[PDB]
C-alpha cells in the first residue's frame, strides 16, 4: 500500500493566537480589541481605549493591561469607548470575553448587532409575549419566556 498519501494539516495552526507573556516591560496605552460573532469578525485588532461588559456576576469594565481573565457574557448590551471619546454599543447574544495581562481582548460571541438597527416598537410587543410565555404554566414555554424577558429587559432599560 501507499504510506499515508494524505497529511491533513491541523487547522488550528492557521490562526495566530497571542503568546501571553508574564510581562518584562510596561503596559500598552490602549487595548487591542477583536470582536467576533459566529465566524466573521466585526472588529479585528482595533486600538480602543476602554470597554464595558455585562456578565452573570455583574457589570464589568476593562482598561489596558487588565488582569488576565476569561468569563461569560450575560445576554445584553456591550459598551465600547475609543480613544477619541466616542462610543459604540453592540447588542450581543452571550459569549466569552478573553482579557489578557499584555492588554488584548478577544470577545467571541454568537451575535453582535448595532443599536441603530433596532426599534423599541418591535421590542414592545415581544415584551408582553415574553411575559405571557412566563405566566403560561409550562416548562417548555415558561423558561422560553424567562429567557426572552432576560434578553428584552436589558434592551428595555438601555433604550429608555
Amino acid at each position: 500500500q501507499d504510506p499515508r498519501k494524505f497529511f491533513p494539516d491541523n487547522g488550528f495552526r492557521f490562526f495566530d493566537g497571542p503568546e501571553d507573556s508574564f510581562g518584562d516591560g510596561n503596559i500598552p496605552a490602549q487595548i487591542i480589541l477583536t470582536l467576533t460573532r459566529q465566524d466573521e469578525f466585526i472588529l479585528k485588532q482595533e486600538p480602543v481605549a476602554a470597554i464595558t461588559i455585562r456578565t452573570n456576576e455583574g457589570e464589568m469594565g476593562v482598561l489596558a493591561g487588565h488582569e488576565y481573565t476569561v468569563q461569560q457574557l450575560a445576554p445584553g448590551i456591550l459598551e465600547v469607548e475609543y480613544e477619541g471619546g466616542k462610543k459604540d454599543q453592540y447588542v450581543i447574544s452571550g459569549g466569552f470575553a478573553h482579557v489578557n495581562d499584555t492588554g488584548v481582548v478577544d470577545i467571541n460571541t454568537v451575535e453582535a448587532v448595532p443599536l441603530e438597527e433596532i426599534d423599541h416598537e418591535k421590542l414592545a410587543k415581544a415584551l408582553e409575549e415574553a411575559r405571557a410565555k412566563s405566566q403560561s404554566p409550562d416548562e417548555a414555554v415558561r423558561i422560553q419566556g424567562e429567557i426572552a424577558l432576560e434578553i428584552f429587559e436589558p434592551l428595555e432599560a438601555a433604550l429608555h
Binding site: F6, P8, D9, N10, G11, F12, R13, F14, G17, P18, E19, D20, S21, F22, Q38, D39, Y68, T69, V70, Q71, Q72, F96, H98, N100, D101, N108
Partner: protein, 102 residues
Amino acid sequence: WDRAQIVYNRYHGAASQKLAIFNLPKFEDWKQKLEEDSAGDGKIEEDGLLQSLPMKTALGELEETAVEDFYNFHSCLAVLNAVSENELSEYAARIVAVENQL
C-alpha cells in the same frame, strides 16, 4: 467519545481546496490536562504552539458550569468553522469540476 477528529476541506485559494482537521480531546480529559498543566512550569512542547499557562490558571479559577460552557462553546465554533470551510470548498472546487465537464 474519547477524542473527536473533525475533518473538513480548507479553502486556501480558488485552486487550493485541501484537507484540514481539528483534534478535540474529551472534556474530562481536557480538564485533567488543564490541571496537570496549571501546576508545572509553562513551557511549549512543540514548535509554533502558543503558551497557555495564564489561561489555564484563569480557567482553573472558573467554576464548573462555566468551564463546561467554555468547552462546548469553543468546540461549537470549531465545528462551525469546519462547516463554513467545507461549504466554501464545495463551492470552490465544483467550478473546476464543472468547467472540466464542459
